[PDB]
Amino acid sequence: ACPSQCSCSGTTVDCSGKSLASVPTGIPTTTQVLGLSSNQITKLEPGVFDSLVNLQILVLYQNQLTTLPAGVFDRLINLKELYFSNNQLTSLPAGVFDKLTQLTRLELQTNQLKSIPRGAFDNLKSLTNIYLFNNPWDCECSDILYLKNWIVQHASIVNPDGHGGVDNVKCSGTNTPVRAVTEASTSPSKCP
Amino acid sequence: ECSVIGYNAICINRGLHQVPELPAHVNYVDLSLNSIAELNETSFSRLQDLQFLKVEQQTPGLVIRNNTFRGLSSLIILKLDYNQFLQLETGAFNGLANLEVLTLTQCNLDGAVLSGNFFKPLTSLEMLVLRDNNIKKIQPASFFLNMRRFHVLDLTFNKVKSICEEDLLNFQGKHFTLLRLSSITLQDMNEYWLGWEKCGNPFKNTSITTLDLSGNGFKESMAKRFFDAIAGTKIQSLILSNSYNMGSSFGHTNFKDPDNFTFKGLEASGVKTCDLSKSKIFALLKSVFSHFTDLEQLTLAQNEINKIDDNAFWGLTHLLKLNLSQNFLGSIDSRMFENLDKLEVLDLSYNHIRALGDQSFLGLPNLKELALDTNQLKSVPDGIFDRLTSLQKIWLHTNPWDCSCPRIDYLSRWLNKNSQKEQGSAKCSGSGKPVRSIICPTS
Ligand SMILES: *[C@@H]1O[C@H](CO)[C@@H](O[C@@H]2O[C@H](CO)[C@@H](O)[C@H](O)[C@H]2NC(C)=O)[C@H](O)[C@H]1NC(C)=O
Ligand SMILES: *[C@@H]1O[C@H](CO)[C@@H](O[C@@H]2O[C@H](CO)[C@@H](O)[C@H](O)[C@H]2NC(C)=O)[C@H](O)[C@H]1NC(C)=O
Ligand SMILES: *[C@@H]1O[C@H](CO)[C@@H](O)[C@H](O)[C@H]1NC(C)=O
Ligand SMILES: *[C@@H]1O[C@H](CO)[C@@H](O)[C@H](O)[C@H]1NC(C)=O
């Protein structure tokens, strides 16, 4: 059956625009597409998605997420598309995307990320589209070197389809491209 | 560029300026967050199997031309929310005779969307969401008389001037499962308004399962006139939470608490649950709820309640649940909960309670659940719980229990004998040991 606040069609469950403060319970394990956009979800419970092993699309844009719980996506090995735009993410947990071998689209634009943890994207072998613009990247901090090295190596998949490209990943305050920062200009002491 | 998975087509944020080519068998399509400036009849020509379609939040000014959806006889759900300055031709929804759900939240729409012929083709419509638009008056056109399964309407966050009988004429005969009129202000319907008599009964010949009127101020003088006006309307659940003008508030003179006349108009409504939480009620006056003779659940949580007068609960012969959590009762006595013989659940948590009177819970033989947690109780009178013979659950934790002997003798023994009923764990202040574990050397 379909969750109360949600609308279901085939393997799609849309719980969008329902003023939800949390993820609805009783979501069928056969769910391939789960829509939770445009709600008031402020936090995700650890392992809330473990049941949904068939999930290929998870939509969470326009909520109030400040961070994620560790390993929250590790059961979702079939995940293809992940939407996080317009939240308040200030940091990502180490290895949240490590299991997402088939992920082609990762959408992280318009958040509050200062940095990306080392090797966070390394396991994403299928990644076709990643959006990283509109984030206050701390270029004075030395932890940004991973993001720098990664986007300069995979620039073709960064902010494509006229979203600015790799140059639209900009530094906080100076508005300089992140790919252009030097290791000498950064420092471990300027890391919050 | 869309992601196709079975019968699902995901086209979110693809920079699209028109509907893309998709396999002709898909029945769920999400085109949200693109730059489609206009939808017309050619837009969904190759998608006649559509059951669920979202075209939310295009760049401002999306235009939907006549017969855009002509041919989509399988379309059940259509979501078009967050299209700023949405432009609808009057035949925009031609052919959607089987549509059940339409959502048009935050599209800068006005009242003509209900009074004009926009929804005329929607003969199967059941649920209409019109949140956060510019609808100043609710005036459904006459074809709504023939919409036999229309039963859910959401108009939250529209600045509605007023609601009157002649406005809602074409909703008469309907039974709504949900009529959500939350935070709609009703600025004209104040205590001075000359239009009250002419207003009549907006809900004449209309029944409602859940009437949500939360966030509308509802000063006592206004509530009284409003419920006098809709007297006799069958309502099963009444929601009046966040009535920020309701109640006299903490030590004040301007506004009044409700009294025995305030809700008299709901006398014959058959109300089963009533939510008056998050308002500013200071005192419960006598017979204030005496017209809720069918009421089974009542929450008054998060008000400013300092006082419960004699016979405040007079007439509540069927009430099973009373929520008084997050108020300022400070102390409980026997008189306060008279007239609640059938009560099964009582929440007195978060009330700064420092004293329970001797016979506080005497007239509640059917009480199953009693919450007294998160107060300031150091002690209870001996025998305070002995007549609660139906009791199944009790909360006593987060209180500064004084575990000196023999003061704690009754409670420690009672909590031990009834350990299966205690939810959470009452603790001695100081030592931190469970009160249930204390054995006094004497008694
Ligand atoms: C879009 O459709 C509406 C309604 O189907 C059209 O308006 C009607 O036009 C007929 C004439 O063919 C009039 O007799 C009706 O009175 C009109 N209805 C209303 C509510 O005005 C409208 O002309 C169409 N617009 C376009 C551009 O095709
Ligand atoms: C009485 O109403 C209060 C407030 O509406 C309810 O409080 C909730 O209680 C749960 C657990 O008891 C908490 O997790 C929520 O955070 C509380 N909500 C708020 C807004 O504080 C309370 O549950 C109700 N009591 C009963 C018996 O139904
Ligand atoms: C319908 O819209 C498409 C895309 O906006 C446009 O190319 C086409 O000319 C339109 N056709 C009509 C008949 O309006
Ligand atoms: C409206 O009035 C008619 C005739 O008096 C009655 O049969 C019908 O049940 C009423 N409908 C509602 C919803 O009250």
XYZ file of C-alpha atoms and ligand atoms in Angstrom:
719
model
C 0.000 0.000 0.000
C 0.920 3.673 -0.398
C 1.897 5.868 2.585
C -0.881 8.224 3.770
C 0.657 11.571 2.790
C 1.983 10.165 -0.484
C 0.829 9.513 -4.062
C 1.873 6.283 -5.770
C 2.091 5.181 -9.388
C 3.849 2.005 -10.400
C 7.202 1.965 -8.623
C 6.989 5.688 -7.916
C 6.195 7.199 -4.525
C 5.779 10.972 -4.473
C 5.598 12.566 -1.020
C 6.512 16.006 -2.297
C 4.950 19.253 -1.127
C 3.238 17.769 1.907
C 4.882 19.790 4.696
C 6.555 16.588 5.864
C 8.943 16.976 8.789
C 10.236 13.420 8.389
C 10.359 10.493 5.941
C 7.025 8.619 5.846
C 6.959 5.038 7.105
C 5.707 1.963 5.274
C 7.388 2.722 1.981
C 7.174 -0.448 -0.155
C 10.509 -2.196 -0.722
C 9.625 -2.327 -4.433
C 10.049 1.450 -4.649
C 12.327 2.574 -7.475
C 11.566 6.304 -7.363
C 11.051 8.208 -4.109
C 10.142 11.897 -4.097
C 10.502 13.875 -0.893
C 11.119 17.324 -2.372
C 9.612 20.615 -1.154
C 8.981 19.568 2.436
C 10.301 20.606 5.854
C 12.528 17.586 6.414
C 15.270 18.748 8.761
C 17.063 15.471 9.462
C 17.239 11.884 8.246
C 17.238 8.996 10.708
C 20.203 6.627 10.379
C 19.318 3.652 8.177
C 15.941 5.120 7.194
C 16.480 3.941 3.619
C 17.939 0.477 4.324
C 14.688 -1.236 3.297
C 14.535 0.348 -0.154
C 17.171 -1.782 -1.896
C 15.488 -1.199 -5.279
C 15.706 2.603 -5.092
C 17.190 4.185 -8.215
C 16.028 7.774 -7.750
C 15.986 9.719 -4.482
C 14.706 13.294 -4.587
C 15.328 15.521 -1.560
C 15.710 19.017 -2.983
C 14.135 21.994 -1.172
C 14.193 20.635 2.363
C 16.065 21.778 5.497
C 18.829 19.151 5.662
C 21.970 20.439 7.398
C 23.894 17.183 7.130
C 23.429 13.473 6.480
C 23.832 10.495 8.801
C 26.791 8.238 7.997
C 26.160 5.262 5.732
C 22.602 6.412 5.063
C 22.879 5.462 1.376
C 24.965 2.283 1.722
C 22.064 -0.094 1.099
C 21.061 1.848 -2.032
C 23.551 0.171 -4.365
C 21.255 0.587 -7.359
C 20.868 4.354 -6.881
C 21.161 6.231 -10.187
C 20.066 9.794 -9.340
C 20.358 11.804 -6.123
C 18.925 15.328 -5.705
C 20.010 17.570 -2.803
C 19.704 21.099 -4.177
C 18.287 23.893 -1.984
C 18.952 22.435 1.430
C 21.263 23.758 4.158
C 23.990 21.114 4.029
C 27.068 22.364 5.888
C 29.052 19.114 5.687
C 29.015 15.575 4.264
C 29.961 12.435 6.238
C 33.030 10.429 5.202
C 32.172 7.860 2.539
C 28.466 8.588 2.050
C 28.671 7.958 -1.677
C 31.204 5.129 -1.588
C 28.627 2.418 -2.329
C 26.920 4.349 -5.129
C 28.791 2.659 -8.003
C 25.985 3.247 -10.491
C 25.169 6.863 -9.602
C 25.092 9.002 -12.745
C 23.535 12.193 -11.361
C 24.504 13.890 -8.089
C 22.921 17.239 -7.424
C 24.485 19.274 -4.612
C 24.133 22.876 -5.799
C 22.779 25.675 -3.574
C 23.740 24.468 -0.114
C 26.238 25.603 2.525
C 29.151 23.238 1.859
C 32.614 24.651 2.671
C 34.391 21.522 1.564
C 34.145 17.947 0.305
C 35.745 15.162 2.420
C 38.769 13.495 0.794
C 37.824 10.735 -1.655
C 34.081 11.375 -1.369
C 33.587 11.028 -5.132
C 36.275 8.409 -5.816
C 33.912 5.424 -5.978
C 31.433 7.156 -8.301
C 32.593 5.415 -11.498
C 29.335 6.004 -13.378
C 29.014 9.723 -12.613
C 27.745 11.682 -15.626
C 26.332 14.815 -14.012
C 27.398 16.546 -10.830
C 26.265 20.010 -9.776
C 28.328 21.860 -7.196
C 27.691 25.542 -7.872
C 26.219 28.013 -5.378
C 28.223 26.793 -2.389
C 30.491 28.898 -0.119
C 33.642 26.898 -0.830
C 36.415 27.786 1.612
C 39.479 28.225 -0.602
C 41.669 29.419 2.276
C 41.217 26.010 3.881
C 43.517 23.222 2.772
C 40.738 20.606 2.715
C 39.481 22.099 -0.551
C 42.427 20.530 -2.368
C 40.456 17.317 -2.929
C 37.617 19.181 -4.612
C 40.166 21.124 -6.665
C 42.039 18.031 -7.838
C 38.816 16.165 -8.531
C 36.928 18.806 -10.533
C 39.984 19.612 -12.617
C 40.242 15.910 -13.500
C 36.524 15.411 -14.209
C 35.672 18.905 -15.468
C 33.479 17.609 -18.303
C 30.872 16.234 -15.877
C 30.913 19.275 -13.572
C 27.975 21.695 -13.938
C 27.094 20.689 -17.503
C 24.219 21.824 -19.742
C 25.025 25.512 -19.305
C 25.395 25.528 -15.528
C 28.736 27.302 -15.822
C 30.968 24.274 -16.150
C 33.931 23.600 -13.870
C 34.488 27.354 -13.485
C 31.116 27.785 -11.761
C 32.576 26.025 -8.726
C 33.637 29.278 -7.102
C 35.503 30.417 -3.995
C 33.745 32.116 -1.086
C 34.208 35.898 -1.077
C 36.722 36.208 -3.920
C 34.466 34.418 -6.433
C 37.577 32.833 -7.992
C 37.391 29.377 -9.645
C 38.293 26.559 -7.252
C 40.340 24.778 -9.919
C 42.711 27.761 -9.941
C 43.695 27.729 -6.261
C 47.270 26.853 -5.296
C 48.315 24.560 -2.452
C 50.581 27.372 -1.257
C 47.613 29.748 -0.911
C 45.788 27.269 1.338
C 46.480 26.370 4.963
C 45.360 23.735 7.512
C 45.116 26.500 10.139
C 42.424 28.368 8.190
C 40.209 25.290 8.467
C 37.233 25.810 10.825
C 18.597 13.487 -21.467
C 15.696 12.284 -19.298
C 16.240 9.260 -17.079
C 13.781 6.524 -18.085
C 13.139 3.715 -15.600
C 10.319 1.391 -16.560
C 7.178 3.482 -16.910
C 8.820 6.404 -15.079
C 10.472 9.323 -16.856
C 12.535 11.675 -14.725
C 13.305 14.953 -16.442
C 14.065 17.118 -13.410
C 16.398 20.037 -14.081
C 17.432 19.210 -17.630
C 17.322 22.759 -18.974
C 14.385 21.770 -21.177
C 12.429 24.402 -23.119
C 9.822 21.961 -24.374
C 8.514 18.465 -23.656
C 11.204 15.980 -24.819
C 10.790 12.773 -26.814
C 9.945 9.897 -24.480
C 8.895 6.266 -24.912
C 5.149 6.322 -25.645
C 4.266 3.869 -22.868
C 5.452 5.826 -19.797
C 2.738 6.754 -17.301
C 4.721 8.818 -14.787
C 6.624 11.886 -15.971
C 8.375 14.534 -13.874
C 9.276 17.690 -15.813
C 9.866 19.910 -12.758
C 12.515 22.665 -12.560
C 12.924 23.263 -16.301
C 12.495 26.285 -18.562
C 9.316 25.364 -20.408
C 7.648 28.666 -21.243
C 4.460 27.258 -22.768
C 2.471 24.026 -22.916
C 0.125 23.402 -25.845
C -1.707 20.512 -27.529
C 1.457 19.263 -29.236
C 3.315 19.048 -25.929
C 1.898 15.676 -24.847
C 0.897 14.249 -28.253
C 3.263 11.286 -27.916
C 2.349 10.539 -24.279
C -1.303 9.434 -24.166
C -0.658 6.870 -21.391
C 0.117 9.498 -18.757
C -1.352 8.780 -15.296
C 0.868 11.024 -13.167
C 2.423 14.252 -14.469
C 4.464 16.916 -12.663
C 5.490 20.157 -14.363
C 6.329 22.149 -11.240
C 8.432 25.235 -10.845
C 9.288 26.178 -14.393
C 10.952 29.552 -14.856
C 8.338 32.252 -14.063
C 5.367 32.718 -16.378
C 4.489 29.254 -17.682
C 1.566 29.476 -20.086
C -0.798 26.526 -20.496
C -2.772 26.802 -23.749
C -6.161 25.274 -24.538
C -6.272 21.501 -25.037
C -2.751 20.963 -23.717
C -4.104 17.850 -22.004
C -6.745 16.850 -24.549
C -6.324 13.132 -25.109
C -4.816 12.348 -21.702
C -7.853 10.312 -20.655
C -5.711 8.268 -18.282
C -4.313 11.262 -16.394
C -5.154 10.931 -12.680
C -2.742 13.319 -10.970
C -1.540 16.669 -12.301
C 0.866 18.769 -10.232
C 1.739 22.270 -11.431
C 2.905 23.964 -8.220
C 5.367 26.860 -7.815
C 4.836 28.243 -11.281
C 5.144 31.955 -10.523
C 2.703 34.034 -12.576
C 1.088 30.883 -14.024
C -1.041 31.765 -17.048
C -4.049 29.544 -17.752
C -6.261 29.758 -20.809
C -9.821 28.905 -19.798
C -9.752 25.613 -21.687
C -6.356 24.628 -20.242
C -7.750 21.437 -18.701
C -9.990 20.214 -21.555
C -10.029 16.412 -21.798
C -9.166 15.723 -18.153
C -12.531 14.152 -17.322
C -10.818 11.420 -15.298
C -8.379 13.629 -13.322
C -8.672 13.179 -9.547
C -5.901 15.372 -8.116
C -4.822 18.858 -9.182
C -2.267 20.911 -7.272
C -1.673 24.596 -8.021
C 0.151 25.838 -4.954
C 1.953 29.186 -5.137
C 1.047 30.156 -8.704
C -0.209 33.733 -8.120
C -3.737 32.627 -8.971
C -6.835 34.500 -7.859
C -10.486 33.665 -7.172
C -11.451 33.571 -10.837
C -9.723 30.188 -11.000
C -12.731 28.840 -9.052
C -15.468 31.061 -10.489
C -14.367 30.793 -14.119
C -14.569 27.678 -16.278
C -10.990 26.430 -15.709
C -12.120 23.432 -13.656
C -15.291 22.818 -15.683
C -13.804 19.841 -17.556
C -12.697 18.235 -14.279
C -15.828 16.157 -13.568
C -13.931 13.479 -11.607
C -11.896 15.926 -9.496
C -11.568 14.844 -5.867
C -8.703 16.886 -4.457
C -7.752 20.461 -5.270
C -4.735 22.157 -3.661
C -4.643 25.947 -4.049
C -2.269 26.906 -1.237
C -0.545 30.242 -1.051
C -2.159 32.023 -3.956
C -3.977 35.393 -4.133
C -7.479 34.084 -3.637
C -9.480 36.736 -1.817
C -12.914 35.149 -2.180
C -14.068 31.551 -2.438
C -16.758 31.441 -5.137
C -17.086 28.082 -6.897
C -18.896 28.156 -10.233
C -22.098 26.176 -10.710
C -20.512 23.140 -12.399
C -19.187 22.224 -8.930
C -22.746 21.096 -8.113
C -22.159 18.153 -10.438
C -18.661 17.241 -9.254
C -19.894 14.239 -7.287
C -16.573 13.113 -5.799
C -14.997 16.469 -4.978
C -14.184 16.175 -1.282
C -10.805 17.775 -0.497
C -10.011 21.446 -0.825
C -6.889 23.192 0.475
C -6.767 26.992 0.467
C -4.144 27.513 3.214
C -2.233 30.837 3.105
C -4.720 32.666 0.858
C -5.794 36.037 2.252
C -9.526 35.325 2.136
C -11.556 38.454 3.023
C -14.559 36.498 4.317
C -16.655 33.351 3.714
C -20.397 33.635 3.310
C -23.436 31.623 2.283
C -23.726 33.125 -1.176
C -19.999 32.531 -1.806
C -20.188 28.825 -1.172
C -23.596 28.275 -2.751
C -22.215 25.772 -5.222
C -20.543 23.650 -2.516
C -23.946 22.993 -0.910
C -24.825 19.295 -0.759
C -21.172 18.323 -0.621
C -19.444 16.251 1.991
C -15.802 17.268 2.420
C -13.407 14.833 4.001
C -11.013 17.784 4.375
C -11.722 21.446 4.068
C -8.473 23.183 4.929
C -8.965 26.909 5.635
C -5.818 27.447 7.653
C -4.094 30.835 7.913
C -6.524 32.589 5.591
C -6.958 35.643 7.923
C -10.644 36.461 7.175
C -9.773 40.123 7.952
C -13.279 41.443 7.158
C -14.994 38.999 9.547
C -14.218 40.961 12.695
C -16.477 41.813 15.635
C -17.546 45.126 14.054
C -18.465 43.789 10.621
C -21.874 44.897 9.285
C -21.942 41.861 6.986
C -22.552 39.188 9.634
C -26.349 38.789 9.231
C -26.158 38.910 5.439
C -23.326 36.342 5.686
C -25.757 33.595 6.758
C -24.285 30.086 6.956
C -21.358 29.547 4.588
C -21.571 25.773 5.199
C -25.334 25.461 4.692
C -26.322 21.920 3.620
C -22.647 20.931 3.802
C -20.912 18.318 5.938
C -17.225 18.181 6.765
C -15.084 15.426 8.254
C -12.087 17.636 9.100
C -12.536 21.394 9.221
C -9.145 23.062 9.571
C -9.494 26.683 10.682
C -6.100 26.982 12.399
C -3.937 30.107 12.335
C -6.812 32.546 11.906
C -6.676 34.555 15.158
C -10.197 33.658 16.351
C -10.598 36.248 19.071
C -13.431 35.045 21.307
C -15.949 37.631 19.998
C -15.140 36.535 16.489
C -15.278 32.790 17.154
C -18.690 33.237 18.756
C -20.135 35.027 15.712
C -18.473 32.571 13.348
C -19.820 29.452 15.043
C -23.219 31.077 15.524
C -23.213 31.584 11.741
C -22.353 27.956 10.869
C -24.581 26.413 13.565
C -25.792 22.950 12.694
C -22.905 22.156 10.347
C -21.864 18.521 10.783
C -18.140 18.500 11.631
C -16.326 15.467 12.979
C -12.922 17.079 13.596
C -12.471 20.745 14.270
C -8.990 22.220 14.096
C -8.486 25.617 15.730
C -4.845 25.385 16.764
C -2.761 28.614 16.667
C -5.733 30.814 17.412
C -3.354 33.530 18.559
C -6.183 35.910 19.629
C -8.184 33.225 21.480
C -7.902 33.421 25.260
C -7.019 36.199 27.673
C -3.349 35.187 27.788
C -0.928 35.556 30.699
C -2.094 38.343 32.980
C -3.982 40.575 30.594
C -7.049 42.737 30.021
C -7.664 43.124 26.285
C -8.866 39.739 25.075
C -11.169 37.226 26.741
C -11.137 33.512 27.428
C -13.964 31.552 25.778
C -17.096 30.997 27.909
C -20.278 28.921 27.789
C -21.592 30.934 24.819
C -18.460 30.940 22.706
C -18.985 27.528 21.064
C -22.752 27.229 21.422
C -23.204 27.202 17.650
C -21.428 23.803 17.506
C -24.173 22.323 19.695
C -25.611 20.100 16.965
C -22.435 19.498 14.970
C -21.528 16.064 16.330
C -17.870 17.078 16.836
C -15.691 14.126 17.915
C -12.237 15.735 18.198
C -11.324 19.373 18.873
C -7.902 20.933 18.668
C -7.464 24.284 20.449
C -3.731 23.885 21.001
C -1.129 26.672 20.626
C -3.563 29.411 21.531
C -3.593 31.742 24.529
C -6.287 30.459 26.825
C -5.593 31.420 30.459
C -8.631 30.065 32.304
C -11.124 27.324 31.488
C -14.480 28.853 32.426
C -17.604 26.940 33.439
C -19.429 24.999 30.730
C -17.093 26.418 28.076
C -17.188 22.974 26.418
C -20.768 22.031 27.398
C -21.971 22.101 23.788
C -19.507 19.411 22.752
C -21.745 16.604 23.932
C -20.321 14.109 21.410
C -16.667 15.086 21.885
C -14.201 12.215 22.456
C -10.788 13.952 22.195
C -9.829 17.475 23.197
C -6.388 19.015 23.139
C -5.580 22.290 24.882
C -1.817 21.762 24.732
C 0.540 24.760 24.612
C -1.863 27.437 25.799
C -1.338 29.658 28.832
C -3.723 27.863 31.127
C -3.265 28.772 34.780
C -6.807 28.029 35.973
C -9.545 25.459 35.617
C -12.805 26.753 37.149
C -15.545 24.604 38.694
C -17.579 22.815 36.035
C -15.191 23.740 33.250
C -15.743 20.278 31.789
C -19.492 20.175 32.402
C -21.308 18.399 29.575
C -18.304 16.388 28.300
C -20.094 13.094 28.806
C -18.223 11.217 26.054
C -14.672 12.606 26.360
C -11.976 9.927 26.340
C -8.866 12.014 25.914
C -7.797 15.324 27.435
C -4.473 16.885 26.546
C -3.375 19.749 28.836
C 0.352 19.429 28.177
C 2.629 22.494 28.182
C 0.551 24.855 30.287
C 0.929 26.495 33.711
C -1.521 24.701 36.030
C 1.020 24.628 38.864
C -1.242 22.625 41.136
C -4.025 20.054 40.737
C -7.155 19.550 42.839
C -10.200 17.277 42.899
C -12.728 19.818 41.634
C -10.786 20.524 38.468
C -11.471 17.206 36.691
C -15.121 16.740 37.661
C -17.563 15.778 34.880
C -15.106 13.523 33.036
C -16.379 10.078 34.008
C -15.427 8.395 30.731
C -11.900 9.846 30.533
C -9.239 7.291 29.565
C -6.199 9.446 28.743
C -5.063 12.540 30.679
C -1.872 14.457 29.830
C -0.680 16.848 32.552
C 2.983 16.815 31.580
C 4.955 20.110 31.334
C 2.760 22.128 33.706
C 5.165 23.360 36.373
C 3.130 21.264 38.831
C 4.332 21.314 42.450
C 1.232 19.944 44.176
C -1.468 17.330 43.729
C -4.522 17.757 45.949
C -5.664 14.769 48.023
C -8.546 13.605 45.850
C -7.267 14.899 42.522
C -8.150 11.893 40.381
C -11.168 10.606 42.302
C -13.819 11.025 39.586
C -11.864 9.233 36.865
C -12.565 5.499 37.301
C -11.889 4.708 33.624
C -8.523 6.441 33.358
C -6.019 4.221 31.519
C -3.153 6.670 30.877
C -1.934 9.427 33.164
C 1.052 11.595 32.306
C 2.565 13.706 35.111
C 6.146 13.778 33.836
C 8.307 16.903 33.508
C 6.822 18.870 36.362
C 8.155 20.016 39.743
C 6.640 17.397 42.026
C 8.710 16.497 45.085
C 5.946 14.361 46.559
C 2.364 13.117 46.135
C -0.283 12.546 48.842
C -0.666 8.972 50.195
C -3.245 6.955 48.236
C -3.405 9.429 45.338
C -3.494 6.606 42.731
C -5.450 3.877 44.561
C -8.854 4.456 42.937
C -7.434 4.440 39.401
C -8.439 0.809 38.909
C -8.348 0.871 35.102
C -4.859 2.380 34.984
C -2.459 0.880 32.452
C 0.198 3.554 31.962
C 1.620 6.319 34.086
C 4.448 8.802 33.504
C 6.156 10.241 36.589
C 9.734 10.828 35.389
C 11.619 14.156 35.212
C 10.345 15.242 38.635
C 12.558 16.217 41.615
C 11.270 13.377 43.811
C 12.096 13.702 47.498
C 13.104 10.187 48.457
C 13.481 10.683 52.198
C 11.642 8.226 54.468
C 8.854 7.914 55.364
C 7.746 10.625 52.922
C 8.479 8.495 49.850
C 6.973 5.315 51.351
C 3.629 5.260 49.514
C 4.993 6.230 46.089
C 8.033 3.944 46.127
C 5.881 0.958 47.137
C 3.141 1.882 44.644
C 5.617 2.292 41.769
C 7.201 -1.032 42.599
C 3.921 -2.949 42.780
C 2.849 -1.250 39.547
C 6.200 -1.365 37.753
C 4.671 -2.668 34.532
C 2.584 0.529 34.300
C 5.352 3.092 34.757
C 6.502 4.603 31.490
C 10.042 5.798 31.855
C 11.630 6.023 35.254
C 10.942 8.318 38.210
C 14.209 9.116 39.938
C 15.192 10.358 43.404
C 16.626 13.865 43.351
C 20.203 13.715 44.579
C 20.940 9.990 44.495
C 19.335 9.360 41.094
C 18.055 5.895 41.997
C 14.645 4.720 40.785
C 11.881 5.710 43.203
C 10.459 2.205 42.657
C 13.552 0.745 44.369
C 13.369 2.656 47.667
C 12.298 0.590 50.679
C 11.707 2.733 53.775
C 12.793 1.113 57.098
C 9.354 1.961 58.513
C 6.142 3.346 56.957
C -9.952 28.502 -25.000
O -11.145 27.795 -24.586
C -12.209 28.639 -24.118
C -13.296 27.726 -23.598
O -13.342 26.499 -24.313
C -12.661 29.556 -25.249
O -13.680 30.435 -24.788
C -14.990 30.142 -25.317
O -15.163 30.467 -26.705
C -16.487 30.204 -27.199
C -16.468 30.508 -28.680
O -15.845 29.466 -29.421
C -17.500 31.050 -26.434
O -18.820 30.756 -26.884
C -17.384 30.787 -24.938
O -18.234 31.683 -24.230
C -15.941 30.980 -24.471
N -15.807 30.642 -23.064
C -15.339 31.499 -22.149
C -15.270 30.983 -20.741
O -14.990 32.639 -22.444
C -11.478 30.399 -25.700
O -11.861 31.207 -26.807
C -10.303 29.518 -26.112
N -9.153 30.342 -26.450
C -8.341 30.056 -27.472
C -7.196 31.002 -27.685
O -8.520 29.068 -28.192
C -0.388 16.352 23.855
O 0.073 17.395 22.970
C 1.501 17.518 22.917
C 1.810 18.725 22.064
O 0.913 18.803 20.968
C 2.108 16.237 22.355
O 3.516 16.443 22.384
C 4.352 15.623 21.576
O 4.799 14.496 22.301
C 5.732 13.646 21.616
C 6.022 12.485 22.540
O 5.126 12.451 23.645
C 6.980 14.446 21.267
O 7.900 13.627 20.552
C 6.588 15.657 20.436
O 7.737 16.468 20.211
C 5.536 16.485 21.168
N 5.110 17.608 20.350
C 5.246 18.880 20.735
C 4.748 19.920 19.769
O 5.739 19.180 21.822
C 1.700 15.060 23.233
O 2.159 13.832 22.680
C 0.181 14.986 23.398
N -0.162 13.947 24.357
C -0.913 12.880 24.059
C -1.149 11.903 25.183
O -1.383 12.708 22.935
C 3.683 24.414 -29.054
O 4.842 24.677 -28.244
C 6.084 24.359 -28.890
C 7.181 24.559 -27.868
O 6.914 25.668 -27.019
C 6.250 25.233 -30.131
O 7.458 24.887 -30.802
C 5.066 25.031 -31.066
O 5.149 25.944 -32.154
C 3.745 25.254 -30.335
N 2.629 24.942 -31.212
C 1.470 25.606 -31.185
C 0.429 25.153 -32.164
O 1.270 26.529 -30.399
C -28.781 18.779 2.008
O -30.249 18.854 2.103
C -30.944 17.726 1.553
C -32.428 18.040 1.589
O -32.864 18.569 2.836
C -30.556 16.480 2.340
O -31.257 15.345 1.840
C -29.054 16.264 2.206
O -28.650 15.118 2.947
C -28.273 17.490 2.693
N -26.848 17.301 2.462
C -25.908 17.578 3.373
C -24.493 17.303 2.959
O -26.186 18.038 4.479
